[PDB]
Design a protein around this nucleic acid. Structure first.
Lengths: 587, 557
DNA sequence: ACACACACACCCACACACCAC
DNA sequence: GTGGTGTGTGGGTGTGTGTGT
């Protein structure tokens, strides 16, 4: 949609002494740089500096300075400039020009509120205020101004306490009374935000729907495979369930690059312009010449000529013949298919070898936008019985009319939804993964390993003992065992997209208490290459563009990310025997 | 890359003789049918394969002193497939018989071929350089023989000469794939061919290393398996990756590993060629495709750079910095590192597949002790329901990833490991947002009744054998290559405007292999509704009952 | 001396949201 | 009073890599 976030960072000496202004600056840089890459046209940014010793404003309101006006879209150059300007302003009045007497930072909110009203007024875009403060109890708020702020502001207040000084006893007031006053308000601690910005930020992709049709068992191929209403809706003895399909696992490509050419510009900014992609077709016409030479002159020698694609036709290969078909035969070459999920039969999970599955998975679920409660109940019962009997169905699956027909395995799966009710609900679905055809099979004969023989089949007695190496390998595998780590239960592996949607795109450390301890499965790890590239780009921007350092000091991979791509350790065990027997010496 | 097969079929009195176990199919006819089917399959999956077919001893007038070729060692083409199909059709229709076609009659043990000239011809055929096709990278001879004790079997010096010829052929990388035919009434004693086809006897020192190859497996095969033995040997294994497997790098425990693709994804129009036709002259065309910005116009190829976009900022990382960036999580070359081991249930799932599995075998040609170490690893990982978590990249110019390495079960023929890819957190997608959730949360009785009905239906439709890839040809591939085949052979197309309702289902069940199974499923329900038996009649009512529970909710309002 | 199959760039549509000429 | 943008997401297509013997 359209949102707007406003940053109000305290610059009081209490914030500066414990380095809280630097933490605020780093978090602001991270969030603004993450906003800059998307560069949404409907995401507004504004920054105010509060409790400053001096300030220049047109409104003549002291101790409040608007460093950044309302900006959209936020660009990387704009963010770099804003962060450098913030550094300059903070260093300008860091300690030399300290003020005397405390100032009402809360009042600084009120004027900001007017600006928030002034910029948008009637439009219903989301508005929020992000404020960084050192202490909450030291500030004073007028009782009569609370109602004025509540009636004037319709914006959610997000308060981040930058202080790390809390006693065993806990007591809260002031700001909390404001937090209760304005709905959708909340409080955070700066350490949580600093932790969250350093963790790998996983992406969230909204499901689309890749298929809509019917899952049918026992339908007649006459009515479901004709240029007519091609379902089993007209049935008297068969199983038909309205069904839709969504992506389940899809291979993410790494952060791409732009093939660009350097421009010679007087401004000396090292500018790169992206190239265009134009496709041409060229042929090589032979040429006859008679030149005196001892060689045969059989090297590559032709004249290239570019002709448009309208004069180039596709020649299909059959054995050793490349044939160009007429238009009618090319039309007949396409297989006429019709979308649907035709069940063949049900086999056990172990009766289906794991290597058979050769494609990305997809959710199959009861269609609720064109179906009814009947489809939902039937599909839930089907998935329940498949799960109970450990069945996996084999099916003929077509997604579009003129689309390839696949074979697929349907695995009964259930996804845990918290739901408005206290009791959690396991939503039932199928998971569809393609199975190989006859032409997909590549299985050949490989030489044996355990009791390996010669080519003719004469056994080869390996080594002289099979106790030492076997025991070594068994203890080695026990040493690197990762079964002490738990496994995420079946039901939370796939997460509902609604539970990962938030009212704003602001980086916050998650509103779900169940997100704790989400990093203990060795197999479920973030995209290391994607996060590594993002971290390198962020650090390059931070060091060269704003800090103006002189050499990119490459950051090390984070320990949490490094741990999952590094060998584990259950118990210690020494496998030095191989090197000890081989012997290390400089020859 | 380029492979060649030489079918060499030895005619005998029992060869033309049909078999009761083979259901009125002669071994020679079975071999011809298998060869035709194999050529049809290879024109789809692996074209550019040379196949020759030769028969001996043939008294037929067209011969080479008894070596009659059904077709020479050329790349697969439509003409030879049509030539084989015409012969098969003549045999089936009864216009000609195998006895008549080969001019072979039961006249008291007709002349047998001398094996010396046979192996000389086998060497000559591969050594010849036919101008049409490039040199064969792989060479194989499929030897079909029913005479285990020829004239050369009783000699000794002739055995030495034959063994010398076998060694000479093997030195030219020609590998024999024997199809010795052994019947229940007459076993095939392979001692003679076992002696001839091996590399003789040779000694290096007293305890020195010996030859790693002992020649072809001279184990005879039963006739009923002939076809099963041919189609399963049409394709060599193609190596997908060859990477070091690093078990412990602190103690330098690193072996070699080879990886192949078990099941690919075949698509219809992948193999093609851009041809430019002018008047009556056809030539091949190239498709560059160079990226140039029209505003500049200057040379672009070799002068462009790749820069990371971060909005309106372009980040031009130097190579010396990019390499250090990458080295933080991956090595330069293709590798796999064993990160950990864990139970099979905790890592092996059917709903979290994202890629194609691969098959891994030891590679002892680089890292000594790879085979013995990997055999022990395979034993241990199979002993417990355990796998090995692997981190790394199967190719140097590929992304690092997590994989699961599982020991291959004892049920299948191959020994090795299966490498699946583990989906990353980004790759795992989100379950959609449904518009309703009122399935059976307040209808436990009706939901349970429908559960019972659906389970009852599911119980009988169980697949006994399981999924077999060979029982499902790709319908798009079949239709595409059928159109190509019929255009090349000039065969009139079907689908006239006078189609009938039975004609439609007959065409549908022949164009598609799965549609035949679906018609069987429908016909089972149709038959159950008519069966007078109280047991067979159930499969109707179950389905019938189900259609009520659907309509109980579908059309209430 | 040579066929497949990834990863890598950019390029095409459709769905669904918002918002109005 | 109901069509235009705008984006996101998926799917398509040359290309430069890569197996060894």
């Amino acid at each position: 949609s359209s949102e707007s976030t406003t940053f109000i960072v305290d610059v009081s000496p209490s914030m500066m002494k414990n380095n809280n202004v630097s933490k605020s600056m780093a978090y602001l840089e991270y969030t603004l740089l993450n906003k800059s890459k998307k560069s949404r046209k409907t995401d507004w940014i504004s920054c105010y500096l509060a409790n400053c010793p001096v300030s220049e404003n047109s409104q003549e309101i002291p101790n409040v300075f608007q460093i950044q006006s309302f900006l959209a879209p936020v660009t990387t150059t704009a963010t770099i400039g804003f962060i450098k300007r913030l550094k300059q302003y903070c260093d300008q009045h860091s300690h030399d020009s300290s003020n005397e007497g405390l100032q009402s930072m809360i009042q600084c909110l009120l004027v900001v509120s007017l600006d928030i009203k002034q910029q948008f007024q009637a439009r219903k875009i989301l508005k929020q205020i992000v404020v960084f403060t050192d202490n909450l109890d030291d500030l004073d708020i007028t009782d009569e101004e609370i109602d004025l702020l509540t009636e004037e502001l319709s914006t959610r207040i997000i308060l981040i306490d930058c202080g790390k000084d809390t006693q065993e006893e806990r007591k809260k007031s002031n700001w909390l009374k404001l937090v209760e006053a304005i709905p959708n308000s909340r409080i955070y601690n700066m350490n949580e935000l600093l932790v969250e910005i350093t963790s790998p930020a996983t992406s969230v992709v909204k499901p689309v729907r890749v298929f809509s049709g019917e899952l049918r068992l026992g339908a007649d191929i006459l009515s479901t495979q004709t240029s007519n209403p091609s379902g089993s809706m007209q049935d008297e003895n068969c199983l038909c369930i309205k069904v839709e399909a969504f992506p389940a696992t899809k291979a993410v490509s790494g952060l791409n690059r732009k093939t660009a050419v350097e421009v010679e510009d007087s401004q000396k900014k090292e500018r790169y312009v992206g190239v265009k992609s134009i496709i041409e077709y060229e042929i090589h016409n032979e040429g006859n010449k008679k030149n005196v030479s001892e060689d045969d002159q059989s090297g590559s020698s032709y004249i290239p000529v570019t002709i448009s694609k309208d004069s180039v036709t596709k020649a299909y290969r059959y054995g050793a013949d490349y044939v160009v078909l007429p238009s009618v035969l090319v039309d007949q070459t396409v297989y006429e298919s019709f979308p649907g999920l035709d069940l063949r039969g049900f086999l056990n999970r172990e009766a289906l070898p794991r290597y058979f599955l050769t494609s990305e998975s997809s959710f199959i679920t009861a269609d609720t936008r064109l179906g009814c409660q009947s489809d939902l109940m039937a599909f839930s019962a089907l998935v329940d019985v498949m799960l109970e009997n450990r069945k996996i169905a084999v099916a003929r699956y077509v997604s579009k009319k003129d689309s390839e027909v696949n074979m697929c395995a349907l695995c009964p799966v259930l996804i845990e939804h918290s739901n408005i009710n206290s009791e959690k609900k396991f939503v039932k679905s199928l998971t569809l993964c393609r199975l190989p055809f006859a032409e997909d099979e590549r299985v050949t004969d490989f030489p044996k390993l355990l009791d390996r023989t010669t080519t003719s089949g004469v056994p080869l007695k390996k080594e002289t003992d099979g106790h030492q190496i076997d025991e070594l390998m068994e203890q080695f595998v026990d040493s690197m065992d990762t079964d002490e780590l738990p496994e995420i239960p079946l039901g939370n592996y796939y997460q509902p997209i609604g539970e990962v949607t938030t009212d704003t795109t602001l980086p916050l450390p998650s509103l779900n208490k169940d997100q704790e301890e989400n990093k203990k499965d060795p197999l479920r790890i973030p995209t290391v290459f994607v996060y590594r590239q993002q971290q390198v780009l962020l650090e390059w921007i931070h060091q060269l563009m704003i800090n103006d350092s002189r050499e990119f000091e490459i950051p090390e991979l984070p320990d949490s990310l490094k741990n999952k791509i590094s060998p584990y350790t259950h118990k210690k065990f020494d496998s030095t025997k191989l090197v000890e027997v081989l012997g290390i010496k400089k020859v | 890359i380029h492979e060649g097969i030489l079918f060499c079929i030895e005619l005998s009195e029992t060869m033309f003789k049909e078999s009761s176990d083979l259901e009125y199919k002669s071994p020679l006819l079975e071999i011809l049918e298998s060869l035709d089917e194999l050529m049809s399959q290879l024109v789809i999956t692996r074209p550019g394969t040379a196949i020759g077919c030769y028969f001996y001893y043939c008294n037929r007038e067209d011969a080479k002193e008894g070596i009659y070729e059904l077709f020479p060692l050329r790349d697969i083409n439509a003409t030879f497939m049509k030539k084989l199909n015409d012969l098969l059709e003549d045999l089936s229709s009864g216009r000609i018989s195998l006895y008549d076609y080969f001019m072979f009659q039961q006249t008291g043990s007709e002349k047998q071929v001398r094996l010396s000239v046979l192996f000389t011809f086998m060497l000559d055929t591969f050594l010849e350089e036919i101008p049409g096709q490039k040199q064969l990278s792989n060479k194989r001879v499929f030897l079909f023989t029913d005479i285990d004790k020829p004239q050369e079997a009783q000699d000794i010096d002739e055995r030495a000469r034959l063994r010398r010829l076998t060694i000479d052929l093997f030195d030219n990388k020609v590998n024999f794939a024997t199809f010795f035919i052994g019947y229940a009434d007459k076993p095939f004693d392979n001692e003679f061919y076992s002696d001839i086809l091996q590399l003789g006897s040779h000694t290096n020192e007293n305890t020195g290393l010996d030859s790693e190859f002992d020649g072809p497996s001279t184990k005879p095969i039963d006739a009923k398996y002939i076809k099963s033995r041919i189609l399963r040997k049409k394709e060599v294994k193609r190596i997908m990756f060859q990477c070091p497997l690093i078990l412990d790098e602190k103690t330098n425990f690193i072996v070699g590993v080879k990886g192949y693709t078990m099941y690919t994804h075949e698509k219809a129009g992948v193999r093609y060629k851009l041809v430019y036709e002018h008047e009556d002259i056809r030539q091949e065309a190239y498709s560059k495709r160079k990226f140039l910005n029209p505003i500049t116009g200057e040379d672009v190829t070799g002068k462009t750079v790749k820069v990371y976009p971060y909005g309106d900022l372009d980040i031009n990382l130097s190579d010396s910095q990019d390499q250090i960036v990458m080295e933080a999580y991956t090595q330069k070359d293709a590798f796999l590192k064993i990160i950990g081991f864990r139970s099979s249930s905790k890592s092996i799932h059917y709903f979290n597949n994202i890629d194609k599995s691969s098959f891994i075998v030891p590679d002892e040609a680089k890292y000594e002790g790879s085979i013995r170490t990997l055999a022990s690893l395979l034993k241990i990982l199979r002993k417990k329901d355990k796998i090995a978590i692997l981190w790394g990249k199967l190719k140097s110019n590929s992304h690092p990833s997590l994989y699961t390495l599982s020991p291959s079960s004892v049920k299948d023929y191959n020994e090795g490991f299966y490498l699946y890819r583990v989906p990353f957190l980004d790759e795992i997608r989100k379950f959609p947002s449904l518009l309703s959730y009122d399935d059976g949360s307040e209808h436990k009785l009706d939901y349970d009744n429908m559960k019972k009905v659906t389970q009852s239906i599911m119980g009988y439709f169980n697949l006994r054998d399981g999924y077999n890839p060979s029982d499902f040809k790709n319908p798009l591939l079949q239709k595409h290559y059928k159109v190509l085949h019929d255009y090349l052979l000039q065969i009139e197309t079907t689908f006239d405007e006078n189609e009938t309702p039975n004609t439609k289902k007959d065409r549908m069940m022949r164009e598609d292999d799965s549609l035949r199974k679906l018609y069987y499923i429908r016909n089972k329900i149709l038959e159950s509704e008519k069966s007078e038996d109280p047991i067979i009649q159930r499969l109707n009512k179950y389905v019938k009952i189900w259609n009520m529970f659907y309509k109980k909710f579908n059309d209430d309002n």
